[PDB]
Scaffold this active site. Structure first.
Site, PDB file in Angstrom:
ATOM      1  N   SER A  59       0.762  -1.254   0.000  1.00 40.83           N
ATOM      2  CA  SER A  59       0.000   0.000   0.000  1.00 40.83           C
ATOM      3  C   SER A  59       0.799   1.315   0.000  1.00 40.83           C
ATOM      4  O   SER A  59       0.218   2.361  -0.157  1.00 40.83           O
ATOM      5  CB  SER A  59      -0.970   0.044   1.164  1.00 40.83           C
ATOM      6  OG  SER A  59      -1.967  -0.969   1.015  1.00 40.83           O
ATOM      7  N   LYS A  62       0.243   3.544  -2.962  1.00 38.46           N
ATOM      8  CA  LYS A  62      -0.803   4.575  -3.007  1.00 38.46           C
ATOM      9  C   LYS A  62      -0.275   6.010  -3.004  1.00 38.46           C
ATOM     10  O   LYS A  62      -0.949   6.910  -3.537  1.00 38.46           O
ATOM     11  CB  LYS A  62      -1.796   4.378  -1.872  1.00 38.46           C
ATOM     12  CG  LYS A  62      -2.537   3.043  -1.897  1.00 38.46           C
ATOM     13  CD  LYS A  62      -3.470   2.943  -0.695  1.00 38.46           C
ATOM     14  CE  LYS A  62      -4.409   1.756  -0.765  1.00 38.46           C
ATOM     15  NZ  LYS A  62      -3.759   0.448  -0.531  1.00 38.46           N
ATOM     16  N   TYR A 145     -10.741   2.774   4.637  1.00 37.90           N
ATOM     17  CA  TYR A 145      -9.552   2.548   3.840  1.00 37.90           C
ATOM     18  C   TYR A 145      -9.863   1.446   2.842  1.00 37.90           C
ATOM     19  O   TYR A 145     -10.354   0.360   3.218  1.00 37.90           O
ATOM     20  CB  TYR A 145      -8.391   2.217   4.755  1.00 37.90           C
ATOM     21  CG  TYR A 145      -7.053   2.005   4.079  1.00 37.90           C
ATOM     22  CD1 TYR A 145      -6.328   3.065   3.529  1.00 37.90           C
ATOM     23  CD2 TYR A 145      -6.487   0.754   4.052  1.00 37.90           C
ATOM     24  CE1 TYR A 145      -5.076   2.855   2.937  1.00 37.90           C
ATOM     25  CE2 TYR A 145      -5.267   0.532   3.443  1.00 37.90           C
ATOM     26  CZ  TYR A 145      -4.560   1.579   2.888  1.00 37.90           C
ATOM     27  OH  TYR A 145      -3.317   1.300   2.320  1.00 37.90           O
ATOM     28  N   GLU A 264      -0.459  10.271   4.655  1.00 33.09           N
ATOM     29  CA  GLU A 264      -1.197  10.586   5.860  1.00 33.09           C
ATOM     30  C   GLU A 264      -0.256  11.401   6.732  1.00 33.09           C
ATOM     31  O   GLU A 264       0.917  11.079   6.813  1.00 33.09           O
ATOM     32  CB  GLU A 264      -1.689   9.299   6.529  1.00 33.09           C
ATOM     33  CG  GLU A 264      -2.697   8.554   5.647  1.00 33.09           C
ATOM     34  CD  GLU A 264      -2.974   7.128   6.077  1.00 33.09           C
ATOM     35  OE1 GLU A 264      -2.768   6.797   7.274  1.00 33.09           O
ATOM     36  OE2 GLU A 264      -3.441   6.330   5.220  1.00 33.09           O
ATOM     37  N   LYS A 300       3.300   6.526   5.248  1.00 34.44           N
ATOM     38  CA  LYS A 300       2.426   5.505   4.668  1.00 34.44           C
ATOM     39  C   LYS A 300       2.987   4.125   4.991  1.00 34.44           C
ATOM     40  O   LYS A 300       4.187   3.898   4.853  1.00 34.44           O
ATOM     41  CB  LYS A 300       2.274   5.669   3.163  1.00 34.44           C
ATOM     42  CG  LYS A 300       1.216   4.755   2.535  1.00 34.44           C
ATOM     43  CD  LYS A 300      -0.202   5.189   2.873  1.00 34.44           C
ATOM     44  CE  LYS A 300      -1.257   4.184   2.441  1.00 34.44           C
ATOM     45  NZ  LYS A 300      -1.421   3.045   3.384  1.00 34.44           N
ATOM     46  N   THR A 301       2.098   3.230   5.425  1.00 30.73           N
ATOM     47  CA  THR A 301       2.401   1.814   5.614  1.00 30.73           C
ATOM     48  C   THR A 301       2.031   0.992   4.375  1.00 30.73           C
ATOM     49  O   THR A 301       1.151   1.373   3.581  1.00 30.73           O
ATOM     50  CB  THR A 301       1.627   1.220   6.818  1.00 30.73           C
ATOM     51  OG1 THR A 301       0.215   1.484   6.697  1.00 30.73           O
ATOM     52  CG2 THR A 301       2.112   1.803   8.130  1.00 30.73           C
ATOM     53  N   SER A 303       1.696  -3.440   3.369  1.00 37.67           N
ATOM     54  CA  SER A 303       1.823  -4.804   3.883  1.00 37.67           C
ATOM     55  C   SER A 303       1.215  -5.762   2.873  1.00 37.67           C
ATOM     56  O   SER A 303      -0.006  -5.818   2.746  1.00 37.67           O
ATOM     57  CB  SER A 303       1.080  -4.972   5.198  1.00 37.67           C
ATOM     58  OG  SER A 303       1.396  -3.988   6.160  1.00 37.67           O
TER      59      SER A 303
HETATM   60  C1  LIG Z   1      -1.710  -2.172   1.894  1.00 36.04           C
HETATM   61  O1  LIG Z   1      -0.570  -2.638   1.994  1.00 36.04           O
HETATM   62  C2  LIG Z   1      -2.912  -2.983   2.198  1.00 36.04           C
HETATM   63  N1  LIG Z   1      -2.746  -4.402   1.924  1.00 36.04           N
HETATM   64  C3  LIG Z   1      -3.489  -5.170   1.121  1.00 36.04           C
HETATM   65  O2  LIG Z   1      -4.372  -4.769   0.398  1.00 36.04           O
HETATM   66  C4  LIG Z   1      -3.221  -6.602   1.147  1.00 36.04           C
HETATM   67  N2  LIG Z   1      -3.520  -7.308   2.171  1.00 36.04           N
HETATM   68  O3  LIG Z   1      -4.081  -6.918   3.246  1.00 36.04           O
HETATM   69  C5  LIG Z   1      -4.402  -7.831   4.333  1.00 36.04           C
HETATM   70  C6  LIG Z   1      -3.123  -8.466   4.907  1.00 36.04           C
HETATM   71  C7  LIG Z   1      -5.104  -7.030   5.442  1.00 36.04           C
HETATM   72  C8  LIG Z   1      -5.371  -8.901   3.812  1.00 36.04           C
HETATM   73  O4  LIG Z   1      -4.985 -10.086   3.620  1.00 36.04           O
HETATM   74  O5  LIG Z   1      -6.557  -8.558   3.571  1.00 36.04           O
HETATM   75  C9  LIG Z   1      -2.537  -7.244  -0.004  1.00 36.04           C
HETATM   76  C10 LIG Z   1      -2.083  -6.576  -1.140  1.00 36.04           C
HETATM   77  S1  LIG Z   1      -1.290  -7.631  -2.287  1.00 36.04           S
HETATM   78  C11 LIG Z   1      -1.593  -8.921  -1.174  1.00 36.04           C
HETATM   79  N3  LIG Z   1      -1.201 -10.199  -1.423  1.00 36.04           N
HETATM   80  N4  LIG Z   1      -2.231  -8.574  -0.037  1.00 36.04           N
HETATM   81  C12 LIG Z   1      -3.014  -2.775   3.712  1.00 36.04           C
HETATM   82  C13 LIG Z   1      -4.423  -2.993   4.275  1.00 36.04           C
HETATM   83  N5  LIG Z   1      -2.499  -1.418   3.971  1.00 36.04           N
HETATM   84  S2  LIG Z   1      -1.753  -1.188   5.318  1.00 36.04           S
HETATM   85  O6  LIG Z   1      -1.685   0.212   5.599  1.00 36.04           O
HETATM   86  O7  LIG Z   1      -2.588  -1.950   6.507  1.00 36.04           O
HETATM   87  O8  LIG Z   1      -0.433  -1.786   5.269  1.00 36.04           O
END
Ligand SMILES: *C(=O)[C@@H](NC(=O)/C(=N\OC(C)(C)C(=O)O)c1csc(N)n1)[C@H](C)NS(=O)(=O)O
Ligand SMILES: [Zn+2]
Ligand SMILES: [Zn+2]
Ligand SMILES: [Zn+2]
Ligand SMILES: [Zn+2]
Ligand SMILES: [Zn+2]
Ligand SMILES: [Zn+2]
Ligand SMILES: [Zn+2]
Length: 347
Positions: A59, A62, A145, A264, A300-301, A303
């Protein structure tokens, strides 16, 4: 490097506690980049992480998608108060006649979910998804989000510029920002620098609809620190400079966090508690009502599965940090380590 002890003291405990195979850390202070690299990009090859290693930043993507959107605005191809359907004929007739581009960008359209439903796995299904979607909240009233939200914003921004998103990013925006090893599609010649992510079961993994726009960037700590520099010292191209500035403006707040385009932001100095709260599960996963907007810290995070990324910087102090790992380790650990390192750099 006399910053190494400080960075190591905050980073090494993360590596041990979460068994992080590799991390690239980059720090900016007084116009100078410092690189600190740990462990391995690939446990099969045992290849060392460097500041040229490509990680999935999830993310954090973004912030780059937001900058494309802002660039589209600066070029006059769109405005943030445009209704979404102005840039997508296939949205005419839907609730997206009455939702703005800025609302898409800031996750405030009315309860678009975090992820597309699993069944939405093609272009045709995606278009039907948005056309049938029923708002949960009035536009602008709640932050939820959302990948579909900003994914769409990025997708329509590219369409406003009459070019595919991946092409605009890789051929214009990213090289304009000084980011020449930042990809949505990693090219053959860059594959050997591309890290593997590691799931909780230590399985190697690599990255959906609008993935590119919402979370699909592969980049290095060097490239990401160049983007941080661009967000502090600026860039040569006038249009890109103005684009970057538009991503700093606060639209609304949730607690002590202020939402802009991608980034943010927080009043700096920022308590660990305030920074943890704005990056909390409550803010990430639930709808929160929007409130009026706020030195400033931007973050920005990101994951993905097998990857965990964080970027934070403070333009007024000329300081910034990038942390890219191939383990999805908890956000609070990232925030705490970054806050501690930046406090030491801020002096
Ligand atoms: C951003 O990094 C965003 N992540 C995702 O959309 C993905 N997974 O999210 C979790 C782990 C919550 C899920 O399994 O639903 C993702 C993108 S590609 C992939 N294989 N998974 C998160 C929510 N943003 S953040 O700010 O929390 O990091
Ligand atoms: Zn862990
Ligand atoms: Zn169709
Ligand atoms: Zn399209
Ligand atoms: Zn598991
Ligand atoms: Zn010039
Ligand atoms: Zn706005
Ligand atoms: Zn509410």
């Amino acid at each position: 490097d006399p910053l190494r002890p400080v960075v190591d003291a905050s980073i090494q405990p993360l590596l041990k506690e979460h068994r992080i195979p590799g991390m690239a850390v980059a720090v900016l202070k007084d116009g100078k980049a410092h690189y600190f690299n740990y462990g391995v990009a690939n446990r099969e090859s045992g290849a060392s992480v460097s500041e040229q290693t490509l990680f999935e930043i999830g993310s954090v993507s973004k912030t780059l998608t937001a900058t494309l959107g802002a660039y589209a605005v600066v070029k006059g191809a769109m405005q943030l108060d445009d209704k979404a359907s102005r840039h997508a004929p296939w949205l005419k007739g839907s609730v997206f006649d009455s939702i703005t581009m800025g609302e898409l960008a800031t996750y405030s359209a009315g309860g678009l979910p975090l992820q597309f439903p699993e069944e939405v796995d093609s272009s045709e299904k995606m278009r039907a998804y948005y056309r049938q979607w029923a708002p949960v909240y009035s536009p602008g009233s709640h932050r939820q989000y959302s990948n579909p939200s900003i994914g769409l914003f990025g997708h329509l921004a590219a369409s406003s510029l009459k070019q595919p998103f991946a092409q605009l990013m890789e051929q214009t925006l990213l090289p304009g920002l000084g980011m020449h090893h930042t990809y949505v599609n990693v090219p053959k010649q860059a594959m050997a620098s591309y890290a593997y992510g590691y799931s909780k079961e230590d399985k190697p993994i690599r990255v959906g609809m609008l993935a590119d726009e919402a979370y699909g960037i592969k980049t290095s700590s060097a490239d990401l620190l160049a983007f941080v520099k661009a967000n502090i010292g600026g860039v040569d191209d006038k249009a890109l400079q103005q684009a970057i500035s538009l991503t700093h403006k606060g639209h609304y707040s949730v607690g002590g966090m202020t939402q802009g385009l991608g980034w943010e932001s927080y009043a700096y100095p920022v308590t660990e508690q305030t920074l943890l709260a704005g990056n909390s599960a409550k803010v990430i996963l639930e709808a929160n009502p929007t409130a009026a907007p706020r030195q400033v810290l931007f973050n920005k995070t990101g994951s993905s599965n097998g990857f965990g990324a964080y970027v934070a910087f403070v333009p007024a102090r000329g300081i910034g940090i990038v942390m890219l790992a191939n383990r999805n380790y908890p956000i609070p650990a990232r925030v705490k380590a970054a806050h501690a390192i930046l406090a030491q750099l801020a002096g």
